[PDB]
Design a protein around this ligand. Structure first.
Ligand code: HEM
Length: 145
């Protein structure tokens, strides 16, 4: 049910993955500047120049498209989530806490831009908690606990 609650508000996100993706990453980097440093392609870009940056927005679109896949899987997602854990642990070297940070930014952005109400905010927190716990379990299988 919590997947369906999120999907009832995904229309504005999928309508403009570029704009909303750029919103998410810009906010992530502004509020959690240590996360920017984890993207070598973006690390060191002055904060005031991130909102207008087309490459940042394009990567945000990649992120949100992947999350939309997952959502549209409703919890049976191992062929999608295991590769994501593998690349984020072993290629990108992302500590697992950072996924909680981006998921809170996403809740705020969906509240502001996608009509996600109080119950939908809780639903999204729950779904992101499922995703993050699966990522964490796969990190541990790789030796990153
Ligand atoms: C649930 C949240 C997230 C999703 C859905 C997601 C999705 C993606 C996808 C689909 C890619 C490209 C394919 C791949 O390399 O696996 C990617 C790349 C990347 N992600 Fe994530 N990601 C998430 C969270 C994060 C966080 C929290 C960070 C850092 C704070 C991060 C850092 C990166 C980096 C550095 C790349 C490589 C970008 C490049 O070289 O072009 N990701 N992510």
């Amino acid at each position: 049910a919590d997947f369906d609650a999120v999907l009832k508000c995904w229309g504005p996100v999928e309508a403009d993955y570029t704009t909303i993706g750029g919103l998410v990453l810009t906010r992530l980097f502004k509020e959690h500047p240590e996360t920017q440093k984890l993207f070598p392609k973006f690390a060191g870009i002055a904060q005031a120049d991130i909102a207008g940056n087309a490459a940042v927005s394009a990567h945000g679109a990649t992120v949100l498209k992947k999350l939309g896949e997952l959502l549209k899987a409703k919890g049976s997602h191992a062929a999608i989530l295991k590769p994501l854990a593998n690349s984020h642990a072993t290629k990108h070297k992302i500590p697992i806490n950072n996924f909680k940070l981006i998921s809170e930014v996403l809740v705020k952005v969906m509240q502001e831009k996608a009509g996600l109400d109080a119950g939908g905010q809780t639903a999204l927190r729950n779904v992101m908690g499922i995703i993050i716990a699966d990522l964490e379990a796969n990190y541990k299988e790789l030796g990153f606990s």
